[PDB]
């Protein structure tokens, strides 16, 4: 899956 | 002196089958909570999970159980994820990083824990009172006498 990073 | 506790973290997430209006295809659920019957508000006076940068509001604060977030998204993310001590002293708080992935279309929904073990030196006579409550145990080294001649 895709994430989210900071 | 030395004081032993435990701690769980934890999150649930589920696929959903039409994605919000917002185009989010999960809804997932964090969590911090103590061992079976242990109330760890004895100890813990809030818990802070901070969510990714897109959530509104994303500094979510629990200060009494349930200690938890539940939300929708699209992507996973890295948590960072405070508890806080009914402590006057330091350590104040305790910082993990918690792994909130999301499953993919064909795989069953999430239901991730993990058990956390803290480890206190000395610490306060009222805090160590707290932490006994909710499951820990209290470690003191003593004099040592052989049983045996030599």
Known sequence: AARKSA | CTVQVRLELGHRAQLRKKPTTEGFTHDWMVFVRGPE?????????????????????????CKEPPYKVEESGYAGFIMPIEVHFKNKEEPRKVCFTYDLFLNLEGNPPVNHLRCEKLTFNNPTTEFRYKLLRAGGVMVMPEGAHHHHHH
Do not use: A, G, M, Y
Not at chain 2, 45 to 58: I, R, T
């Open chain 2, 37 to 61: 019957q242990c109330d760890i508000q004895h100890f813990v006076e809030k818990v802070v999970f901070w969510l990714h940068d897109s959530f509104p509001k994303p500094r979510r604060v």
